Structures are given as C-alpha cells and as structure tokens.
C-alpha cells in the first residue's frame with residue numbers, strides 16, 4: 062500500500078565472489094519483502110485502531126511499525142551502497158573524502174572503526190556511517206536489530222547488514238571475512254550522493 | 263566542544279501551572295546538561311581509540327554516543343515544542359493541520375493515538391510524532407529510553423518526555439494527568455516550522 | 464488470581480530518614496500493585512489465546528508477562544531486603560560473609576562494585592547480587608527495566624531499585640545519595656536466608 | 665576457569681535428518697565455546713576493576729557477563745533437551761505430563777503456544793518453557809538475544825534456539841519447518857528431570 066519493495070540495481074550474482082547470488086536472492090525476495098508487508102500491515106492496524114477507538118494493542122503496533130519500517134529503510138540503503146567491483150571508485154573522493162579525513166583522520170581509520178563496530182555486535186545488528194545534523198559531522202553507529210541504538214534524525218550514508226542471514230551460508234561463523242570482502246563492493250558514488258543531500262539539513 | 267546546552271526560550275516557571283518550574287529547572291540544568299557532557303566525552307574517547315588503534319570498548323562507546331546524543335536531540339526538540347498557554351495556537355492550522363487530517367483522519371484521532379502511545383510505555387521513553395521521508399507521511403513512534411524503537415532517518419516534529427523525572431514531582435504516578443496538562447502548552451507554531459523544514463516545502 | 468500483592472513487613476515510615484514514607488506508600492500501593500494486576504491479566508490473555516486458537520498477539524503477551532512478572536519478583540525481594548536500622552547486622556556474617564570475601568575479596572569491594580553498577584545505569588533498572596547456580600558463585604548484575612540483561616536461572620539475593628520513582632521525590636537527580644542512604648537499611652539476615660536456599664541448587 | 669564447555673551426550677550427526685550435523689558441529693565447537701571464553705573474560709575484567717578501584721567500564725562488563733553467561737546457560741540446556749529420534753518418549757508422561765495439562769489445558773495447546781512464541785521473534789532469541797517458583801506454574805517465555813525478556817529466578821525446562829545460525833544452513837528462512845522438525849528430537853526424559861529438580865519433588 063504505502064511501502065513498496067524496490068528492485069536491485071544489479072543482478073543477484075553481480076557481487077560475486079564477495080557475496081553470493083544465493084544470499085542476495087533470499088535476502089531480497091524473502092527478507093526485505095517481509096519488512097514491506099509488515100510495515101503496511103502495521104499501518105492498517107493503526108488505522109483500524111483509530112476507527113474503532115481501541116488502542117489496546119498500541120505497544121505491539123508501535124514496535125511492529127518500528128521494526129519492519131526500520132528493516133525496510135536499512136535494506137533499501139544497503140542495496141544501493143553496493144555495486145560490482147570496478148563500477149565505483151576504490152576509495153571516497155572530493156567532498157566525501159575530505160569530510161572523512163576531517164572526522165576520522167584518514168580513510169583507513171574510519172574503516173578500522175567501522176569494522177570494529179560491525180564485528181563486535183552482541184546479537185543482530187548493523188554497522189552504520191551517518192550524518193549527525195545537530196553536530197554537523199559524520200559518526201559511526203552500531204544498530205541493535207534494525208531499530209535500536211540510534212538518535213532520531215540520523216541520516217544513513219553507508220550501512221552493513223550484520224544479521225546472520227547475510228553471511229552464514231557463505232562465511233559461516235567467520236564474520237571477519239564477510240566484512241573483509243564487503244569493502245570490495247562498496248559503491249562510494251552512492252554514499253557521495255547521500256552525503257550531499259544529508260548536508261542540506 | 264562539539265555539542266552545547268541550548269538555552270530555554272522562556273523562564274523556568276513560564277509553563278506553570280501545567281508544568282512546574284521546579285521540574286523545568288532540574289530537567290534542563292541537570293538532566294539535559296548531562297547528555298551534552300556525555301555525548302562530548304563519547305566522541306573524545308572514540309578519537310582516543312582510533313589514535314591507539316584499540317577498539318576493545320567499541321560496544322560501550324557506541325552505546326554511550328547513541329544514548330547521550332539521542333538525549334540531547336530529544337530534549338532540544340522538547341523545549342521548543344512548548345510555549346506558555348495563550349502564546350501559541352491552541353490547534354494546528356494550515357499545512358500542518360491538513361496533513362494531520364490526511365494521516366490520522368482528524369486532530370482528535372491524532373491526539374488519542376499519541377496519548378495511548380505515551381501512557382502505555384513499559385519503562386522510560388517518549389511519545390513522538392515524526393516525518394517519514396520514505397513513506398512521505400506523518401507517524402507516531404514510541405521511543406524506549408532515548409535511542410530505541412525507531413527507524414533511521416526519522417525527523418522529530420513533536421515529542422513528549424515520558425521518563426519519570428519529567429512528571430513525578432508534580433503528578434506522581436498519574437501519567438494521564440501529565441499528558442492532559444501538556445497538550446495545553448504545545449507550541450503548534452514550532453511544530454509547523456519543523457514540518458516544513460523536514461522536507462523544504 | 465495467580466499472583467497476589469504481599470504486604471510490607473514494616474510500616475511505610477519505618478525506613479526514615481533514609482527512605483521516606485511518601486515514597487514507600489506510592490511504591491507499594493501504586494507501583495507494585497500494578498505489576499500484580501498486569502501479570503494476572505497477561506495469563507488470562509494467554510489462556511484466552513489458547514481457547515480460541517488465536518496467537519496473533521503472542522509477542523505482546525509474552526512481553527507483558529515478562530515485564531509485569533519481573534516487576535512483581537523484583538519488588539517482592541526488594542521489600543524484604545530492607546529493615547529499620549539496627550534491626551539487622553551492619554555487615555554480613557557467617558556463611559554469607561565468607562562467600563562475599565571469596566567472590567569479591569572483601570565486603571567493601573562488593574559494596575563498591577554494587578554501587579558502581581547501580582549508578583551507571585542508562586535508563587531504568589536494578590543493581591543485583593545473585594547466585595549463579597552454574598558457576599556456583601555470587602555475581603553482580605545490572606538489570607535494564609525489570610526483565611533485561613540477566614541469565615536464566617539467576618536467583619536474586621540482594622536488589623536495589625534504580626527507577627526514578629524510587630528516589631526522585633526525596634533525592635531528586637542525585638542517585639549517589641540515594642544509594643548511599645540505602646546501605647543503612649539493608650536486612651542482611653534476609654539475604655543470608657536467600658543465600659542458603661539458593662545454595663541447594 | 666570458572667566456566668567450561670560441556671561435551672555433547674551424542675555425536676554431531678546423531679540428530680539427522682531433523683538437525684544437520686554440520687550445524688551441530690559449528691554450533692557447539694564454535695558458538696558455544698565463544699560464550700564460555702567471553703563469560704570467563706568478563707569475570708577476569710571485573711576482578712581487575714575491583715583491584716584497581718576503577719569501575720569506569722562497569723556497564724560494558726555487566727552486559728558482557730549477562731550476554732555470555734546467558735548464552736552458556738541457554739545452550740547447555742539446549743543440548744540436553746535433545747536426543748536421537750526413537751531414543752526418548754514421543755510424549756510427556758507422568759508428573760510432567762499432568763502439569764502441562766494443568767497449565768495449558770493439553771499437550772497440543774502447549775505446543776501451539778510454544779510454536780507461536782518461537783516463530784514470532786523479531787530479531788534473535790529463544791522460545792522457553794520455564795518453572796515459575798513464585799506462581800508455582802509452568803510458563804512460556806520469549807527471550808530476546810540470550811539475556812532479555814525474562815524474570816529473575818526463572819528455571820529453564822525446555823529451550824529452543826531461534827537465532828539464525830541454529831537453522832539457516834538447512835532450513836533457510838523457513839522458521840516453521842525448523843520448529844516442526846525439532847519437536848521430533850525433544851528428550852522429554854530430560855525435561856521431566858529438570859522439572860523435578862526445579863522444585864525438589
């Protein structure tokens with residue numbers, strides 16, 4: 062209804078051998094699709110709650126909305142944050158490259174901090190590079206599940222799915238290798254565009 | 263310092279009798295100030311980590327940042343969302359008023375849903391009215407603590423602090439009385455401004 | 464129905480001036496009573512769900528049960544963990560005293576660790592001294608809200624309510640003073656009995 | 665070391681075809697071992713803190729302990745709760761069987777409620793059947809991660825790991841098929857033993 066499932070800007074197997082087509086197909090067709098259906102159903106439920114003036118399940122509906130909508134947002138950004146190797150620059154440049162050096166010291170320091178945040182998660186979660194509109198800087202955050210451990214108003218620039226379904230079929234328990242191979246398919250041109258729009262408040 | 267304590271646009275007792283000046287002074291001078299110092303320290307510690315190449319406490323630092331920065335963000339909007347009785351419109355009008363009718367059916371439905379979300383929180387949290395950039399709609403979210411149960415990219419329009427320190431000294435355990443009194447001091451002018459700036463007309 | 468509200472083993476004002484009778488009366492009559500009613504209602508809801516074979520709200524009911532039942536358990540232990548000054552020994556002795564020296568080094572070290580855990584909570588929570596039946600030792604835990612951040616099978620020995628409603632009317636934002644005064648009314652004889660029953664697996 | 669990795673009461677492929685031996689080996693040798701090392705380190709760090717009188721990282725250490733110790737506890741029960749098909753009763757009997765009928769109406773109702781709690785988890789977690797010492801009854805709880813959404817004093821009787829690593833390699837995203845297969849390998853003899861020891865006859 063309100064939300065729709067976006068299609069991939071590339072073929073399921075375009076990111077191989079870094080991320081297999083098997084994961085991509087299940088991740089998109091099964092997982093992401095579930096969040097879209099869940100977010101719409103949450104809205105229908107909230108609408109029905111208003112019509113009958115019965116808000117007894119408000120706590121459930123607010124979590125259903127937050128969980129599924131955050132899942133939809135996180136994955137929509139995730140797909141575009143990636144592109145076949147060689148399709149995008151190896152490292153950030155111009156506006157983004159300068160900003161990263163300012164807030165992290167160097168590209169490698171930002172990479173090290175992002176990596177540490179990605180692998181240290183106790184449970185499901187995400188590693189994220191966001192624009193802080195209040196402090197007007199780029200920070201790294203560690204999301205719990207899809208909707209926890211983040212300030213309101215945070216604009217996602219670059220995100221990495223650290224839920225097990227994103228790497229288990231390929232890397233098993235070795236998260237370190239998954240994050241290692243992911244750096245090869247990061248679409249820095251997409252992050253650059255997000256950084257530009259985020260900068261206008 | 264990257265973050266600083268904003269000054270109140272009114273005196274501590276300007277919201278009486280709806281909200282005690284005793285609560286306002288402690289809430290701003292003590293509580294809000296703490297989030298600013300915490301958020302600044304979190305960034306300093308992270309800079310320390312990168313310099314030493316030691317990210318052992320990454321999980322702690324990332325939570326310290328999200329919790330404190332979110333507290334800073336939540337209270338900053340909270341102060342401006344309020345104004346003395348009779349100094350602002352008693353009802354949303356124009357663009358904001360039309361949007362609320364479109365996404366909630368009416369102003370009464372919006373209030374009912376917002377109130378239900380406020381009083382039903384199991385633990386500390388917030389009742390929020392945010393702009394959803396993906397679905398291009400206004401939704402109500404129920405924050406847990408300061409940084410939980412919310413999608414990234416959510417832009418706060420109207421917020422209500424449901425932590426016990428925000429009402430205990432005056433209303434005790436009666437959460438219902440607190441929320442009912444709070445509706446009288448809502449500055450709809452500020453909300454309308456945030457609504458327009460959330461998407462630039 | 465299943466759960467009932469236990470009465471205080473002393474008068475509301477018996478713990479003064481460390482904890483006022485005003486807090487005790489509201490905490491018991493209003494707060495604890497709410498958890499008992501909530502826990503029973505959660506069971507009725509789960510029973511009704513089984514009768515009609517409709518488990519659509521299972522996520523809500525499981526959290527309602529866990530939140531309210533944990534609240535009931537935590538406060539039931541909290542009341543007995545306290546007694547008027549002079550009614551119980553100032554420090555633990557015999558079995559308990561020996562165990563504390565073994566797992567913490569000294570009584571003061573356990574006090575310091577417990578205090579640090581109590582005051583550092585980011586949001587609502589509890590500081591707790593529990594018996595770990597797997598490791599067969601006494602550990603300190605920091606509960607989030609009432610039902611988070613604890614292993615299953617943990618047996619509560621000594622607990623301190625760190626929710627704002629437990630100290631705000633008296634100590635305001637100064638948590639440090641609340642914890643400081645609480646040590647004066649700890650009923651070590653009650654903790655000793657809990658330690659004995661916990662030890663038998 | 666305070667904690668140690670328990671050995672499996674059967675071979676890795678003993679539960680096939682219901683649960684793959686590939687999953688069993690990684691789950692025990694890699695995953696469970698990690699919680700043991702983490703729990704031990706958490707205690708060593710806490711001892712370090714007391715010695716230095718520096719509890720600055722108390723919030724991190726307390727979460728590290730709860731998360732890892734809970735993982736250790738949850739998996740220890742999980743292994744024993746299972747046995748090869750045909751090596752244990754296919755249905756609860758005697759004392760345990762009568763108790764389930766008393767608290768759930770029937771075995772089918774218990775299974776339905778347990779299944780609903782298992783498949784509906786939003787994120788990582790567990791479906792648990794515990795003994796409630798306060799209410800003197802058997803309840804179903806839905807754990808988040810390893811250490812969330814549960815009352816203190818809860819004694820685990822039967823547990824099901826709903827984290828993605830527990831079923832992804834064999835069942836993919838179909839959680840329903842995993843839970844349906846798992847019922848075939850439940851060792852009701854072990855559950856009955858834990859039920860009796862939870863309250864000593």
Ligand SMILES: [Fe+3]
Pocket residue numbers: 088092136222224226227
């Ligand atoms: Fe994912």
Ligand SMILES: [Fe+3]
Pocket residue numbers: 289293337423425427428
């Ligand atoms: Fe506040």
Ligand SMILES: [Fe+3]
Pocket residue numbers: 490494538624626628629
């Ligand atoms: Fe309390």
Ligand SMILES: [Fe+3]
Pocket residue numbers: 691695739825827829830
């Ligand atoms: Fe597991």
